[PDB]
């Protein structure tokens, strides 16, 4: 099932929760999802006519959601046909404390709740089966920044097709151009 924070339901989220319920009914992982939960689910066009689906997970469940992440993504790729599935936790970005504000931040903003840390965690989670082994921010002649990510070559073929979908998902919920490549050394 899906439990949102802003007390608002969605039909695509309803379908994703129904798919998770079906997985709970009949699988070898029924004992896993009966405590886990999701928060939201969104479809976005990656390029051409393709589509990709992003699940959103509470942080404490995320590691548990990463024990069985590959099985679940394969199951939902089979069920949702030619659509890739990515699990990115629901991370809140607190605003940078300026000089003009009022009473909504009485405590110091944690680093984990900053935009930089949240986006780094989003990048780390968006490619979960492959581990990040290097990052290069190249600044183009016009000042725009292209991120190039080096992924572990131990698990390459499982995620090589997922590039140009990783990048689209990142561009959609982060706004930064990101590239993915595989280096000879880790």
């Amino acid at each position: 099932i899906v439990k949102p924070n802003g007390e608002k339901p969605d039909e695509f989220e309803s379908g994703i929760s129904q798919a998770l319920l079906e997985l709970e009914m009949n699988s070898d992982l029924k004992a896993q999802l009966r405590e886990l939960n999701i928060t939201a689910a969104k479809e976005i066009e990656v390029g051409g006519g393709r589509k990709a689906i992003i699940i959103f997970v509470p942080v404490p469940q995320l590691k548990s959601f990463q024990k069985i992440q590959v099985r679940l993504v394969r199951e939902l790729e089979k069920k949702f046909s030619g659509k890739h599935v990515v699990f990115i936790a629901q991370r809140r970005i607190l605003p940078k404390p300026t000089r003009k504000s009022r009473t909504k931040n009485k405590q110091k903003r944690p680093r984990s709740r900053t935009l930089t840390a949240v986006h780094d965690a989003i990048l780390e989670d968006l490619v979960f089966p492959s581990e990040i082994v290097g990052k290069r921010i190249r600044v183009k002649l016009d000042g725009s920044r292209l991120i190039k990510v080096h992924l572990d070559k131990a698990q390459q073929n499982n995620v090589e097709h997922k590039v140009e979908t990783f990048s689209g998902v990142y561009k959609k919920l982060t706004g930064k151009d990101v590239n993915f490549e595989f280096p000879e050394f880790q």
Binding site: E131, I132, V133, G134, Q186
Partner: protein
């Protein structure tokens, strides 16, 4: 370079890029915490605890498995020493040098080295006093030092 020596050594640990628990390590975070607690009960400092966790248990970095540093873990459990490890070792070295100097009073090199060690002790104590790790009344003396050791 070195604080009190002309050396410009470069040797130090070079951490890997990844901040993740290694694949070979099956120990859970609570298991590492329990091992740390046992090692601390045995009377070992966080440096020694990390050394024997790395060397025998495959724990490359306790921070990347537990999410917390060893000294912070010990403080949270409540079995951390009164004064920090580096300051305690500096005070121990100063006490040893002073005990040597009483029976060897013509050792001017020992006096020079004791001055250097006590300068390091005072710098570390001032830092820990600003960070409130030590009480603001804490002072290093030439008589009560062996009591703290």
């Amino acid at each position: 370079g070195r604080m009190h020596a002309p050396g410009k050594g470069l040797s130090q640990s070079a951490l890997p890029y990844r901040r993740s628990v290694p694949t070979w390590l099956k120990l859970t975070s609570d298991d590492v915490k329990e091992q740390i607690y046992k090692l601390a009960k045995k009377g070992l400092t966080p440096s020694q605890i990390g050394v024997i966790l790395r060397d025998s248990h495959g724990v490359a970095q306790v921070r990347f498995v537990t999410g917390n540093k060893i000294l912070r873990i010990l403080k949270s459990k409540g079995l951390a020493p009164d004064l920090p490890e580096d300051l305690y070792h500096l005070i121990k070295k100063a006490v040893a040098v002073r005990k040597h100097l009483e029976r060897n009073r013509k050792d001017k090199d020992a006096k020079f080295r004791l001055i250097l060690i006590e300068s390091r002790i005072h710098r570390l104590a001032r830092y820990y006093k600003t960070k409130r790790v030590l009480p603001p009344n804490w002072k290093y003396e030439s008589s009560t030092a062996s009591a703290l050791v």
